Amino acid sequence: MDLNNAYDHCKNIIEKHSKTFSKAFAMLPKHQKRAVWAIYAFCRRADDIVDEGENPKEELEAFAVEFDLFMEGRLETEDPCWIALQDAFERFPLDPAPFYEMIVGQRMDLYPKTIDTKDDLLHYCYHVASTVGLMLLPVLAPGKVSRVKTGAIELGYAMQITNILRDIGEDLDNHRIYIPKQMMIEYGYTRTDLHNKKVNEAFIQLWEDLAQDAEHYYRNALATLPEYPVYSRTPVGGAAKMYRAIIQTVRNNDYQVFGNYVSDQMKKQIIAEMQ
């Protein structure tokens, strides 16, 4: 297909995966929006290989090999995702380094893993979420990367921690735990408590501890919003605030995370306030 239809393929991927990010980034000007769709599709394919694929090691290694060929300018393909990404790399000064770092992060999920400390948690969040922010920065803030970089990394932390806090039960059903072990020890929330899906006062203490770290990172990220060009402020601030709202949604549902969505109407409220 031609470039328009290659980008349209990527628009469908983001629209199907995330109402929050699709709605936020649709507000960008044309070529920035299309580049974000292509970059998002690269992240989505990597994460889907590891989180949903049948042999994730072999399939992720093949994905990494293809991206190597892509960066050498030598990938010949009809895959719409690569056609779109080729244009984005040629149209904006995208840096391959965070793309490689994302693949490093996805490798972290291939084998059994225990998060021991908050520092362990942030190392994981950096490689699977902060890198996405770094991938997007040349599109969202041309010429201003170094002054918004730290906020973008911390927005990554905030969003990934939020994801983890929403998904404790879903991840447990998949034999994954991202809650730091030292935090379960600090608050007396045992593996047996988690296994029984117990929402007790120790659970809430631990959950709120992590949630407050996420809230701190969101606040730090939002403080950098005036340094973005005007056309990125509502997309980035809107993405940040709709994802942050997952936290209060879980609180309002009494921390029941063993069975949470910001409502369509609430997303529209947040976007309207940004605008």
Ligand X SMILES: CC(C)=CCC/C(C)=C\CC/C(C)=C/CSP(=O)(O)OP(=O)(O)O
The binding site consists of 47, 51, 109, 163, 167
Which structure tokens are listed for 48? 């889907």
Identity of the residue numbered 154? E
Residue 263 interacts with which of Mg ion, its own copies, ligand X, none, CB < 5 to 8 Å by class: none
Binding residues for ligand X restricted to 4-33, rule: CB under 6 A: none
Q: How many residues bind ligand X (CB under 6 A)?
A: 16
Residue 79 φ/ψ, nearest 5 degrees: -70, 120
Residues that bind its own copies (CB under 8 A): 53-57, 109-114, 172, 174-175, 177, 179, 181, 184-185, 188, 190-195
188 binds, among its own copies, Mg ion, ligand X, none (CB under 5 to 8 A by kind): its own copies
CB 218 within 8 A of CB 129: no
The yes or no reply on residue 167 touching Mg ion (CB under 5 A) is yes
Tokens of 107: 């490798």
d(CA 264, CA 269): 9
Q: Report, in Å, the least distance between residue 136 CB and ligand X.
A: 5
Tokens 């983890």 map to which residue? 164
Q: Which is nearer to Mg ion, 15 or 167 (CB)?
A: 167
Residues 200-259 within binding reach of ligand X (CB under 6 A): 236, 239
Nearer Cβ to ligand X, position 13 or 129? 129
CB 63 within 8 A of CB 103: yes
Asked whether 33 and 110 are in contact (CB, 8 A), the reply is no
Q: What share of the chain is helix, strand, coil (3-state, %, to 5)?
A: 75, 0, 25
- Please report, as ranges, the residues that interact with ligand X according to CB under 6 A: 47, 51, 128-129, 132-133, 136, 152, 155-156, 159-160, 163, 167, 236, 239
